[PDB]
Amino acid sequence: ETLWDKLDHYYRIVKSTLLLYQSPTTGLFPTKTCGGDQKAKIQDSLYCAAGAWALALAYRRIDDDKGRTHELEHSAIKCMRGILYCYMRQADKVQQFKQDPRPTTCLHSVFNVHTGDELLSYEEYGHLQINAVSLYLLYLVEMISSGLQIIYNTDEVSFIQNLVFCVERVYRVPDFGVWERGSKYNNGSTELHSSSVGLAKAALEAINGFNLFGNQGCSWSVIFVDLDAHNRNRQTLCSLLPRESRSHNTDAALLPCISYPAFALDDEVLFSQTLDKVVRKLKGKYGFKRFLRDGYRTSLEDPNRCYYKPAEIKLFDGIECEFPIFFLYMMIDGVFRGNPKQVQEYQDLLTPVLHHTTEGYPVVPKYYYVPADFVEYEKNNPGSQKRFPSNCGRDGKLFLWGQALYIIAKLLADELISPKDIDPVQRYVPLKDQRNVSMRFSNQGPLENDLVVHVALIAESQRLQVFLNTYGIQTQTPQQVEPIQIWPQQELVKAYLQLGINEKLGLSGRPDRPIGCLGTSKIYRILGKTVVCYPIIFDLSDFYMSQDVFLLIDDIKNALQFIKQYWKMHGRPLFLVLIREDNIRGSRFNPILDMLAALKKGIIGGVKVHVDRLQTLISGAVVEQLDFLRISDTEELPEFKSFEELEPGQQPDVNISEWKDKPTHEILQKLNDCSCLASQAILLGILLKREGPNFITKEGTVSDHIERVYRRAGSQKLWLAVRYGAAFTQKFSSSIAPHITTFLVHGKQVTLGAFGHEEE
Amino acid sequence: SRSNSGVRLDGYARLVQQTILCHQNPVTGLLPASYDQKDAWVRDNVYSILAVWGLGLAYRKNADRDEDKAKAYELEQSVVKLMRGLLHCMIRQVDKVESFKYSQSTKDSLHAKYNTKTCATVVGDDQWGHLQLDATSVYLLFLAQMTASGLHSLDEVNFIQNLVFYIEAAYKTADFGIWERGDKTNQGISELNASSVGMAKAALEALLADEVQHCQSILNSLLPRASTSKEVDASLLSVVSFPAFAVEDSQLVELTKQEIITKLQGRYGCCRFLRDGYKTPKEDPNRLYYEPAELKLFENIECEWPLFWTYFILDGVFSGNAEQVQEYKEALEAVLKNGVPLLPELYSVPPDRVDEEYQNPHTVDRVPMGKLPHMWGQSLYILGSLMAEGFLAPGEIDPLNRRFSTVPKPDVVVQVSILAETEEIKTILKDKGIYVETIAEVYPIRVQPARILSHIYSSLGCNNRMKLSGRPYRHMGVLGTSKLYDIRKTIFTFTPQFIDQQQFYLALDNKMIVEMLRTDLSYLCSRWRMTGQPTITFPISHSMLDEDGTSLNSSILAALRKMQDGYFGGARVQTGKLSEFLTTSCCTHLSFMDPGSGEVDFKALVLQLKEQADILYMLYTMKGPDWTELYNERSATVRELLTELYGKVGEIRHWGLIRYISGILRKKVEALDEACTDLLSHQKHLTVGLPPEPREKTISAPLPYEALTQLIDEASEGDMSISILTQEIMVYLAMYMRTQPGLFAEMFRLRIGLIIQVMATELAHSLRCSAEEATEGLMNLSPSAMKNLLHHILSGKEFQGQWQRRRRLDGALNRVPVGFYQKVWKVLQKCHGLSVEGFVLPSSTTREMTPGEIKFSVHVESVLNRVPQPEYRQLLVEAILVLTMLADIEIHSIGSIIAVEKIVHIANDLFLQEQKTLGADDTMLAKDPASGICTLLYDSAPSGRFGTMTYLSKAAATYVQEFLPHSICA
Ligand SMILES: Nc1ncnc2c1ncn2[C@@H]1O[C@H](COP(=O)(O)OP(=O)(O)O)[C@@H](O)[C@H]1O
Ligand SMILES: C/C=C(\C)CC/C=C(\C)CCC=C(C)C
């Protein structure tokens, strides 16, 4: 057989069983091949466009395609510039979702195939499926990489960026998932799914730095991911990884993630721990159960009731529908991972379950259900009964997602397309090649982690540089690095606020959050100047924790250890240890000098460091060019401020209880007789309540005297006062919320509240 | 390139971004018309992206660095995005494309406006007059051009070909126009605009040539006039010049441009058309329509649109020029925002200054209103600037070489293959010297009738997924059935339409076939503008042989021998084997065809039939109407022997009988809707019966074959043997307009009944006989002999009574003098109207008809040319022109509607008195039994002291004497 004949076989199957159904208008493919349903699901269209693109990737190996490469590729662009249209019309929702990711602010995931309009509402359907926004972005990168031009103007690039700002914060947005129901229980509940976070980690790894314009592209067409938000997704997937979610210890949606298309997991032991549970607990003769205790189109499921009631989930144990598609994903995984006998084992399993249409074209039935009469026999001896197909194709019903995966798997298995061809962005990294892949693997490899962070000791003043030199540490004042500009992280957050700003689509820009230690560890070219950012550890704060130098030295060690464990980008990380004259004041000098000295020795906390001059450290380094700032509306470039040289009691005697029963101006009396900054905080804190925010004090507004006592005992290191002060003035740290997410990303749950009192 | 050409390119980039690309919707790619008009017009979107496409082309011809590649890619993909958005706008209306494909109704047309945020529809079908063939045609044209420039599913290809079928019948489809208001009167009346026809022709040429050359016929006939109700439209620049270039006549293009400049061009642009009143201070802003009496008000104060001067820079760039006067005159640009030109939509005479502008035309300082910037005009302004400053070339915007239309195209040599149907026929052809090949020998080339070709195209364009059903069955003329076709790897050649149509008497006459072949060759030699050389397959059938069968028809031999000699039909012809013509033919490939009295009891009255064959037939109408497909009681029915009678009289070729049998059996010409559509295609109206007015039902617009045929039948009022004459004469007029259209000049309303009557009169005076026996011998004429009579009727060739014959010939042909209609416009200014036979042509018509309209012509020809008698009419024509003659010398105006007939008669009564006295027989001059006008008055020459026109001058002067008591003549 010639290649033309070998691939005309797939073009007949693709054209009859997939591209016939593509909407002439939207480009999206319909979920129901035959019928009046107008639903086009987002995920199924992406898998359908990928199937046409896989045939184009095959027809690229024939020069006389007879037009079939342009049509099959341009069908894929049609579907992908149709999902973009559906999303671009709902960009009022992309702005709302960046700011408040929630089940009822999401981009809809089911649209009218004919018109692109919203079909089912938030009540009717769970539209929060971030597997879909995330696979749109993985497929847009994988298709634009192939040569397929899907993004056409700067406004489409700004929407893809705003789509990225949404896909970054997936770790904190629980969703419904590929299966649209949430958990095994259809309680209408969203949960974090390794599958949705895993596809987001993959879209973000693929789209960071990607010209959406392809070869015909410049700096102003690149998408920029947050290295810190991507880390938070990597941390979440890893914490939850052998499993899918609180509810599912295994789901077959993990197979699309762990392997084609995302190829997300970067641990070979977790991939095997995740795949083995999926194959062992979910494989079947007719396919893979989506999840154990699944009621989809089961004989025992009630058709009328949308939501399974508690303990119903037991009735579906052994009756679970088995989806033949998962056999096709396992065959694609085998072609990618070089197992020529996992392709055969699962090809052999699919040849029997595959129906054929009247013209002989293969139909992959969506699910194989146990017929109602045989449910008890299967439950008694699972794997014994014969399950009827869900779609036979002759019925007029075809699973368009499965039809597309047959084309991808059959082409990959027959070697008519290559693993490299369908993963232009290299999502699968073979083990031997897991070395220098950005955001995933570092030169050292997959297992070794002795990163040398490139420290640069920057001193607030020349006075402090000369003082630090006398005591042994060469530091550089902000001016001595003249072309390089040292910026607070907040000044990068201001610059990023101009990324993705489209006023035509109502989009605003990066949400105003803190850039963290994996984004302040990068050298940036912003408006023609080189900007290096001091870490957020060095940012001044109202909270009293800042005063302890030992906590600063520990936050410096803690940050460098995070940079070591989680920085997998090409350059060496750049940590700038800003030293402020307050840091060396008093006996803080001895602790700071030991940190600064260890940074000079090359090790602080097990993290090897190379202190050196910023000019030498920034020299051949990769610089992220922030080209989105431009001039934009204002004919002036934005105004960015950069760090500049700052040129020159034993116990409180007053107990709260015995001194609060008094309402007296006498609390204002002891206030004049309390030298304790803890008695003052207790006495001048009873009054922030009973007399008011401004009840006049001898000193002035009470709000000013507690902030004076809090600040004063903060310096005098009088910690009972600093804590009565912080509390009385109700002080909260910016970091409480960022840290409470470490607990959550790691599968832990924090309870705040005292012991013996109301917990939350 | 960045030294001094990249900076200016960036300046134009800012221009396009801040005028056009700023308003492009990121979701749909469409462009809203303005802030107030948030909807996206198809034509405005297509035109507004031309600047972006040109900038992308500019950027690319100099794209070497990345950044420049990024800008070029962004511009090209913005153009692609806009066109795709317009596609999904049309794709969502596939049910309308499919419906308009067969039934070209305004209620089944693609919408002009679309929601710029969802590619959906904003208003209802009833709410905007959406039928605009120019918008869809300009979209198709620029889709073809952009693709030929490198700008990139099959389902949308099928949709695009269905759109090709949609705009395919635009030469005969009424339109709402480029200005989406139909006719000028502005009552939502769909009208045929040459702008739409030219744009459709350009789109079809860029993307079946038969309807293309039909559109070409519409363009030639209509230009320099725009449509029926428009003397000239400034939108014609979009046809005679960029972007369509649909007129290949350089003289016609120059004449259209000169008409636009002379009539519409003003100090602030060109008015769209005379008496437009789109944004004039005289209209009612909140009233959608226009009363017919306020169109005068709009005269000399129409809004001048700067958009049309962008067309005058574009031509001038496309055709090299010092029309750098059109530029430098566009200093009338709004802002010099920052300094952005912001080309306005129109300039309106300030309201106070209406009287000054009316009186002194193109002189008042108008104000800018409407859209600002006019993105359709702004894009053309930027494109013209780009092209004029050397950053762009005509060959980049026009990669299909549409600009080379005007160049004279050489005569084409039509290769003809004469093919023998049978081998015996081949033997006869050889004895006589024409060496041919049989249809069997021409294998593997398969010869098929043109019906099969028309049916094959019905399978082109079909996707049942989106409910698109091929192409409607359209008759393929000589142009379509002259290319060779590659269907399933075997070459198929198709004989012309006129050969397989053997259902009417025309095919029995071999001379007719010769004449049809000659007309087809003449049409081919002029209208073939296709790659390849056209190939007419001419098989000689057994019916083409003589009576004996051992010899071929003389006429057919003579035609074949002339074709062998290289010339026949005004065309150079090369005859040869069809196998030789493969390498130099338009071998198009059809890839869609690949698989994958007393005694009223009529018991015994037909017994008399059981040999004159005339009488046998005569009885047969008594037995048809009284008794058509009913029984005869001898294993026979009325229709059967009438068909047997028809065959018998065809064998004996006694043509009177064939015609009668055909007439009572209701034989109808299949390609008769084609004949009527061709005659109306040349801006000629048709009327179908005997001349008194109600019977003579006029044909102002094309009619479907069923209606046309039904109109013919009711126009005979049951009087047989004219209903067939109407079809036969219509066919002959169509052939003569295809071949010798000069013969049809100064003719605008073909009266078939009057034509038939004048042919009878000519057969009465030539071969002198009674007018009646001549009316019967007209039946017995061969179809080719009757066509010859018609030729001689038209050209006035002859095989003291002459002047009556001429007056008759010209009146029956409805021939008007050159400039007659404009002269009638002039008298209507003086008088209150003309009255012919009691029907009034009011002066109020001029208040809504500019003099050169072909809608005022029709108004005049419906009040004047309706006169039954052929001559009375030609006299009424004189009395109008002598009224026109004397209106100039007369210095005053009269408040009467002048009855022209009276002037004709007063001249009649003045003809008795003068001739009697000069001394002539009282019986020498006798009155007409129809008109009451002396026969000798008709026989009188026009000029002279006793000329008929002199008598009307002595009559009109004696007619307006009581109306105009005093006449201070010049
Ligand atoms: N004040 C802070 N202290 C510590 N880490 C912070 C602080 N602010 C932000 N971060 C870190 O910066 C990254 C991104 O910031 P942000 O969007 O605020 O994170 P999150 O949404 O997890 O709270 C996270 O890794 C977060 O933990
Ligand atoms: C000066 C008088 C004549 C030359 C006699 C003929 C002219 C008329 C009878 C009136 C013409 C004026 C019109 C408005 C028709």
From Swiss-Prot, chain A:
GO process terms (BP)? generation of precursor metabolites and energy; glycogen metabolic process
**Membrane-spanning regions, if any?**
none
Sequence segments annotated as region (Calmodulin-binding): 708-735
A GO cellular component entry from the record: plasma membrane
Q: Which GO terms describe its molecular function?
A: calmodulin binding
Record text on subunit structure and interactions: Hexadecamer of 4 heterotetramers, each composed of alpha, beta, gamma, and delta subunits. Alpha (PHKA1 or PHKA2) and beta (PHKB) are regulatory subunits, gamma (PHKG1 or PHKG2) is the catalytic subunit, and delta is calmodulin.
The family classification in the record reads: Belongs to the phosphorylase b kinase regulatory chain family.
Kindly provide the name given to this protein in its UniProt entry.
Phosphorylase b kinase regulatory subunit beta
Gene encoding it? Answer: PHKB
UniProtKB/Swiss-Prot annotation, chain B:
Asked whether the UniProt record includes Cell membrane among its keywords, one would answer yes
Q: In which pathway does it act?
A: Glycan biosynthesis; glycogen metabolism
Q: Which GO terms describe its biological process?
A: generation of precursor metabolites and energy; glycogen metabolic process; positive regulation of glycogen catabolic process
Provide the membrane topology annotation. Lipid-anchor
Q: How is its activity regulated?
A: By phosphorylation of various serine residues. Allosteric regulation by calcium.
Question: What does the UniProt PTM comment say about this protein?
Answer: Although the final Cys may be farnesylated, the terminal tripeptide is probably not removed, and the C-terminus is not methylated.
The record ties this protein, via InterPro entries, to:
6-hairpin_glycosidase_sf, 6hp_glycosidase-like_sf, GH15-like, KPBA/B_C, PHK_A/B_su
Per the record, lipidation of type S-farnesyl cysteine is found at C969
The entry describes its oligomerization and partners as: Hexadecamer of 4 heterotetramers, each composed of alpha, beta, gamma, and delta subunits. Alpha (PHKA1 or PHKA2) and beta (PHKB) are regulatory subunits, gamma (PHKG1 or PHKG2) is the catalytic subunit, and delta is calmodulin.
Q: What is this protein called?
A: Phosphorylase b kinase regulatory subunit alpha, skeletal muscle isoform
This protein's species is: Homo sapiens (Human)
The lineage is: Eukaryota, Metazoa, Chordata, Craniata, Vertebrata
